[PDB]
Design a protein around this ligand. Sequence first.
Ligand SMILES: *[C@@H]1O[C@H](CO)[C@@H](O[C@@H]2O[C@H](CO)[C@@H](O[C@@H]3O[C@H](CO[C@H]4O[C@H](CO[C@H]5O[C@H](CO)[C@@H](O)[C@H](O)[C@@H]5O)[C@@H](O)[C@H](O[C@H]5O[C@H](CO)[C@@H](O)[C@H](O)[C@@H]5O)[C@@H]4O)[C@@H](O)[C@H](O[C@H]4O[C@H](CO)[C@@H](O)[C@H](O)[C@@H]4O[C@H]4O[C@H](CO)[C@@H](O)[C@H](O)[C@@H]4O)[C@@H]3O)[C@H](O)[C@H]2NC(C)=O)[C@H](O)[C@H]1NC(C)=O
Lengths: 102, 45
Amino acid sequence: EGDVTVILNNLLEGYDNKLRPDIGVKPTLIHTDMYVNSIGPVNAINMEYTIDIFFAQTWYDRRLKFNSTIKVLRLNSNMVGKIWIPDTFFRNSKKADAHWIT
Amino acid sequence: DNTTVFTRILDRLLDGYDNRLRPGLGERVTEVKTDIFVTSFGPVS
Ligand SMILES: *[C@@H]1O[C@H](CO)[C@@H](O[C@@H]2O[C@H](CO)[C@@H](O[C@@H]3O[C@H](CO[C@H]4O[C@H](CO[C@H]5O[C@H](CO)[C@@H](O)[C@H](O)[C@@H]5O)[C@@H](O)[C@H](O[C@H]5O[C@H](CO)[C@@H](O)[C@H](O)[C@@H]5O)[C@@H]4O)[C@@H](O)[C@H](O[C@H]4O[C@H](CO)[C@@H](O)[C@H](O)[C@@H]4O[C@H]4O[C@H](CO)[C@@H](O)[C@H](O)[C@@H]4O)[C@@H]3O)[C@H](O)[C@H]2NC(C)=O)[C@H](O)[C@H]1NC(C)=O
């Protein structure tokens, strides 16, 4: 219990992560950003280059709306699997992977 | 009945526990004390 626990448990009840926000109203406007860390080696025999980025996305979800004194819920990756995330894929990536340690 | 004494303690610890929130979320800063034991410094590419 507490303050953030009941807020999260009230946001996530009656929530479907299968349906995008405004499924039958309007397109979801997503503001993307990126922060390259170190463009890696440009391989010429195999015709690709390696890039390490901090890919960040921002959108609006009217179901994730709460009224309290808390302004920002700073959460870890455990809450990713419970909410909706756009299926952004890189159209010219031969192989890519996120980082899972620790 | 010997294992139920610690089973009840472990079930009481996680009863009502929210693992999405850091400890001392509303009152302090969570300080993490860390150290590294390098078992083997591997080869340098
Ligand atoms: C065909 O078969 C293969 C093999 O069975 C299937 O692939 C497997 O798919 C499942 C389901 O998606 C994966 O399970 C999930 O794995 C991720 C972590 O993935 C990373 O680790 C993998 C394991 O690494 C082993 O091998 C390496 C080898 O070097 C070792 O170093 C490691 O120590 C391990 O031994 C690794 O394989 C992954 O790499 C692969 O996938 C990535 C994808 O991005 C590719 O790029 C890579 O090239 C490569 O193909 C990767 O490094 C876990 O995080 C998952 O657990 C979370 O999600 C679960 C589902 O939601 C959830 O139940 C868990 O609780 C957990 O949730 C947590 O994390 C979420 C993250 O957002 C949160 O949202 C959530 O709230 C919570 O916090 C899960 O265990 C297998 O790992 C994967 N394995 C392989 C070998 O690919 C394949 O899908 C099958 N194909 C078809 C079409 O059926």
